[PDB]
Write an enzyme that holds these catalytic residues in place. Structure first.
Site, PDB file in Angstrom:
ATOM      1  CD1 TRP A 141      66.948 108.815  84.323  1.00  0.00           C
ATOM      2  CD2 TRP A 141      65.924 110.309  82.931  1.00  0.00           C
ATOM      3  NE1 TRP A 141      67.796 109.160  83.390  1.00  0.00           N
ATOM      4  CE2 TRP A 141      67.242 110.039  82.544  1.00  0.00           C
ATOM      5  CE3 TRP A 141      65.147 111.203  82.195  1.00  0.00           C
ATOM      6  CZ2 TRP A 141      67.800 110.652  81.418  1.00  0.00           C
ATOM      7  CZ3 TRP A 141      65.698 111.819  81.068  1.00  0.00           C
ATOM      8  CH2 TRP A 141      67.014 111.546  80.683  1.00  0.00           C
ATOM      9  CG  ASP A 144      60.937 109.026  79.737  1.00  0.00           C
ATOM     10  OD1 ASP A 144      61.543 109.227  80.778  1.00  0.00           O
ATOM     11  OD2 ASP A 144      61.529 108.833  78.686  1.00  0.00           O
ATOM     12  CE  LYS A 156      68.424 103.765  79.192  1.00  0.00           C
ATOM     13  NZ  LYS A 156      67.346 104.698  79.437  1.00  0.00           N
TER      14      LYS A 156
HETATM   15  C1  LIG Z   1      67.570 106.034  79.677  1.00  0.00           C
HETATM   16  C2  LIG Z   1      66.357 106.933  79.952  1.00  0.00           C
HETATM   17  C3  LIG Z   1      66.034 108.030  79.147  1.00  0.00           C
HETATM   18  C4  LIG Z   1      66.938 108.557  77.998  1.00  0.00           C
HETATM   19  O1  LIG Z   1      67.791 107.670  77.261  1.00  0.00           O
HETATM   20  P1  LIG Z   1      68.779 108.152  76.105  1.00  0.00           P
HETATM   21  O2  LIG Z   1      70.125 107.481  76.555  1.00  0.00           O
HETATM   22  O3  LIG Z   1      68.903 109.616  76.175  1.00  0.00           O
HETATM   23  O4  LIG Z   1      68.246 107.557  74.872  1.00  0.00           O
HETATM   24  C5  LIG Z   1      64.902 108.746  79.425  1.00  0.00           C
HETATM   25  N1  LIG Z   1      64.085 108.396  80.460  1.00  0.00           N
HETATM   26  C6  LIG Z   1      64.382 107.316  81.237  1.00  0.00           C
HETATM   27  C7  LIG Z   1      63.446 106.918  82.375  1.00  0.00           C
HETATM   28  C8  LIG Z   1      65.512 106.586  80.990  1.00  0.00           C
HETATM   29  O5  LIG Z   1      65.835 105.536  81.824  1.00  0.00           O
END
Ligand SMILES: *Cc1c(COP(=O)(O)O)cnc(C)c1O
Ligand SMILES: *Cc1c(COP(=O)(O)O)cnc(C)c1O
Lengths: 396, 396
Positions: A130, A211, A246
């Site tokens: 990411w 994460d 999500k």
């Molecule tokens: C969506 C995501 C995040 C962070 O999501 P927030 O919208 O900031 O809560 C962190 N790491 C990965 C791999 C993600 O897909």
């Protein structure tokens, strides 16, 4: 003293967004979205969270500050979610959870605590990962190195290359793992590969940082946590940054948590106080509304049952779209083996298209995808699937 | 690698909090609170914001991500609030507002942008100032120096000492000003002293950073902004960090804004993109609920009228308590001249008590105050005023 300030780079997906909503030709499909969309191409607010919000509206009597670490049912509920309802980590209270401004917030606060209170200097991130990972760690002064992960040819996890680049990591380095639904490839370790990684991690002295943004999207809530759980039965210390953006459809309410696990109760408390010092110097104390909603859904059996059904329906929609994609491409017909799509978990995967092909997709057909061939499967509907697959077949 | 982590220091007010709610003797009054309380000793949620929240519950269809800078009515409404409804800064669009996780969030994001994109190295903060100032700037690597402000003897603004320490500040240093209701003294510059400070600030090349957390608490919304407004008619660039925690009673929803003003439209946009880069690397994009509530109250005439009445009632309650305090002390009788209390604005002021006296207040009487003699006037009610003043008279 702002005239010589260089403009910040065009953001990887937000650029595509603006370009898309400027193309006046409505056969257009945007697959570079980053968010979930249902069969109607809408990102709805869940029924459980609206029921939740009505309850809160009826029962809140004050908007007074939450403590540095947020609301105390929230942090018992995500560590039950993360570690299992009767985990030894919970019974021996060696885990502490701070409620943070989403999953990104959880990573900046872990990065600042680490940078100020320990001797870490490098964080190992997967290639690819990411994209905002590098920025978060770099801004706290940690340096990012990356480890091998994706095999472009077989479209799989090059596990041996993974284990091999991760040996230049010394003891005391942090290694970032995606708990399930690896962004952006959708390839996850199998439980057996997780267990060897956990065993290699103790031998070498890595600080694991998980994460965990997609709990419930690969197979189910408990199943998706078994990798992390192999890594918290083996290790005295780890950090997990989780997101609720999500799986609860609460993206803009910022809902996440940073959980610190240490060898015992005394040290996790002594470390957690410095993590609290890191929050005070940033945003002081966290957003109540989104975390409050998460706490009352997860603590209410009736509301939790509804959310669990709603999350399984999202998960299944994504799995049905990955399936429909592969065989509608086989019906439109080209030399392909897009079956790897069926093997990947979550909303994203690399389609295998070249940047010249994603360019003429955009330009000649109105199908928008990220220049790397990254596609978000939740932007596909039973209705837009046939024009989508025609466009792809025509550029292959 | 957490066993040698030193515990973070006992937080200045949160310690008092725990000590208070452990004293089992209910004649106890906590004046070290930091939040507003009404005549009932409650911190209520306002009627306008509950009306707001019902509207949002009825009309929101998605919790999809806000842009890096938050919702676009919010930032036109706080810069109208800040600069005046027809300000040249707004018409020539040289101001850009990012919605942040409260006023503390606005200060960390200003500090990170400054530390990464300009050559500032020092921030000048008043002695005394709100304590979390040092931590926020220090964590972004800026060094804090302080300038003289409060005259302990006359309990007033030692303006000459102020102007004199502020000359070791070089061009390119940032100087932090509290826009109205100076925390913790309650003494503000008069408009004439603001104008000389504005004139001295251009001559010397200071970057002004206004911390504006109490709009509407000293005299009224427009009146409280005239200091800042003297400083944005004179200056090509300034930053103002504002909070909505207190004037909207939205403390835990984190609602604030960081507004950047530059010489013209092109440079404020080019600088603002780097400020957006600073948000991406921290919490990514801001909390919708609290800022959403603020936007619909401030844009709806009926809801805005209600909030304005509610804010004036808070302001007047504080002014009546400062008045009642001074003469109930004159009725309980001691050698005093607590009349300076009437001259200070906002919820806080130094009572002039010594730390030994605040100690026997706590210990012998159950009146809790911060060790510096800092008192929060909103913790006083018509009912607790008489035992409070007896306790103070007895220790003088
Ligand atoms: C969506 C995501 C995040 C962070 O999501 P927030 O919208 O900031 O809560 C962190 N790491 C990965 C791999 C993600 O897909
Ligand atoms: C309250 C306050 C802030 C920050 O408020 P938030 O609760 O973080 O919105 C900043 N400066 C001063 C002087 C304050 O009193």
């Amino acid at each position: 003293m702002f005239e010589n300030i260089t403009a910040a780079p065009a953001d990887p997906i937000l650029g595509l967004a603006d370009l898309f909503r400027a193309d006046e030709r409505p056969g257009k499909i945007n697959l570079g979205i980053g968010v979930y969309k249902d069969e109607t191409g809408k990102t709805p607010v869940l029924t459980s969270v609206k029921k939740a919000e009505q309850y809160l509206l009826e029962n809140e009597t004050t908007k007074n500050y939450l403590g540095i670490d947020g609301i105390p049912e929230f942090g018992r509920c995500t560590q039950e979610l993360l570690f299992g309802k009767g985990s030894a980590l919970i019974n021996d209270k060696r885990a502490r959870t701070a409620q943070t401004p989403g999953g990104t917030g959880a990573l900046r606060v872990a990065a600042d605590f680490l940078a100020k209170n320990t001797s870490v200097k490098r964080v190992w991130v997967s290639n690819p990962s990411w994209p905002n990972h590098k920025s978060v760690f770099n801004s706290a002064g940690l340096e990012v190195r990356e480890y091998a992960y994706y095999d472009a040819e077989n479209h799989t996890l090059d596990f041996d290359a993974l284990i091999n680049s991760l040996n230049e990591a010394q003891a005391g380095d942090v290694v970032l793992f995606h708990g399930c639904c690896h962004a952006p490839t959708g390839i996850d370790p199998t439980l057996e590969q997780w267990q060897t990684l956990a065993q290699l991690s103790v031998e070498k002295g890595w600080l694991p940082l998980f994460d965990f943004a997609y709990q419930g999207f690969a197979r189910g809530l408990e199943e998706d946590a078994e990798g992390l759980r192999a890594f918290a039965a083996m290790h005295k210390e780890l950090i997990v940054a989780s997101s609720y953006s999500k799986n609860f459809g609460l993206y803009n309410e910022r809902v996440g948590a940073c959980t610190l696990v240490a060898a015992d109760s005394e040290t996790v408390d002594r470390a957690f106080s410095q993590m609290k010092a890191a929050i005070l110097a940033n945003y002081s104390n966290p957003p109540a509304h989104g975390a409050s909603v998460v706490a009352t859904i997860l603590s209410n059996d009736a509301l939790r049952a509804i959310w669990e059904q709603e999350l399984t329906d999202m998960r299944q929609r994504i799995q049905r779209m990955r399936q429909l994609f592969v065989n509608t491409l086989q019906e439109k017909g080209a030399n392909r083996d897009f079956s790897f799509i069926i093997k990947q978990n979550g909303m994203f995967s690399f389609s295998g298209l070249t940047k010249e092909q994603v360019l003429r997709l955009r330009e000649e057909f109105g199908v928008y995808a990220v220049a790397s061939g990254l596609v978000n499967v939740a932007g596909m509907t039973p209705d837009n699937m046939a024009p989508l697959c025609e466009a792809i077949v025509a550029v292959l």
